[PDB]
Amino acid sequence: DPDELARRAAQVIADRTGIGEHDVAVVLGSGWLPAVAALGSPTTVLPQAELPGFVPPTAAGHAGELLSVPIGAHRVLVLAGRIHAYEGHDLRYVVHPVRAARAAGAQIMVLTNAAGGLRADLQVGQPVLISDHLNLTARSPLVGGEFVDLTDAYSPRLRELARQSDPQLAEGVYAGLPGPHYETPAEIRMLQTLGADLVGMSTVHETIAARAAGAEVLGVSLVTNLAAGITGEPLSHAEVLAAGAASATRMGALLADVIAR
Template identity: 60%
Template sequence: MQGGPLHAGGQTPFAAADGAAARLRELTGAETHDVALVMGSGWVPATDALGTADHEFPVTELPGFPAPAVAGHAGTVRSYRIGDKRALVFLGRTHYYENRDVAAVAHGVRTAVAAGCKTVVLTNGCGGLRVGMRVGQPVLISDHINLTATSPIVGPNFVDLTDLYSPRLRALCQQVDPSLEEGVYAQFPGPHYETPAEIAMIRTMGADLVGMSTTLEAIAAREAGAEVLGISLVTNLAAGMTGEPLNHEEVLQAGRDSAARMGSLLSQVLGKL
């Protein structure tokens, strides 16, 4: 497996992930982690429900991780003991629009898998496309449409993406909260919001949710052998659906308003893994 473009210094992405995982073990004293969570825009307040972290440090302490460039992304890493599991939580992510290569986008999940994680939970704040969706509503990602025109995988490594977003994990979430809906998530590269015409296009294609993250990380996690769960928080209705302009602050506010519900969902699901 080649895994994508070379990192700085000529390392392959998997070698870079191994190096970051080794440093993670030094910082946490934990030989392995079981599950990783990547907290997207609006999701950071929800982590309070996970309890007190055993360790927390800036993500820049790990090789290959830049400082966060987006408001609402704390740029720290936490290590938790939840039941008999060790959870690794990234409070923020690298986005493709940050003028970085796709290997940097995938570095977090590759590091998590190199550190032992068998499950990767990807969260994001997104625009809702389906009639009836509400701001503050969590939606399980059932599939995705990758409109970034790129992949974290290079070379003849033909990874099957059928059931990329684990049906088993989605069913587990719906046991915790039977009201959870599912939807197809579309990723544009960003950072600009989509036009109403683009929203009309992806609705015709079958998308229910739209954002600027997640799909590339999900592909990289599948390539690395992890089971993937994706959860979107509808933080706004997509362009052209309300007549109102879009802004990032409403994304963060929706996360604050929904923190208790999101945190409860995450903590209960992690307890069942």
């Protein structure tokens, strides 16, 4: 049962961290690990694999670690790594970390990801606030009887708080696709026609599950590339990884400052 597995996970988290309740959770995606160094000093770090119901992250740069971090009056559950629908897991396992974080007390989820830019004026390494999403997976993490409203799924209030730390932050609609193949240029033109600004392979189900469980969501993409058929700056793979790591390191400090309110 998803709710009971979430309650068991939250019990182990409380016991292993010695913290009764974490009021904020952060899921770090691909390219986001460098944010850890700037978020704060962890009081506990443990493998996700030792938590009930957690399929260990396997994607390159997903540590598969949970960090407990004090940030002002807040106790922040940091999930360094997530699992993806393209790994073949039932969506109940994909959204279990978010349900476990809610059961551990998290009222606000920061969901981070890597994304393709669908606009030629986005830059590799640019952080982009998620204004909304397009679920283009033909799936839901919810079952019969769970009829959840996704108006303001990405809290306007949280984007406003982020812009108090960096008022220049861009925003965009994130298209969640199944993957794991990348898009054809014709698919990228279609996504622009459907009103998407960003493309990736996570987040939409985690957002739906977070809203169904009564949590507010702040979504942040790191643009790792311009999407198929959009020509962008000639960068080496080292320049792409370096630009991403520098933004992820800066965004850790920004998230710490925003969470601290």
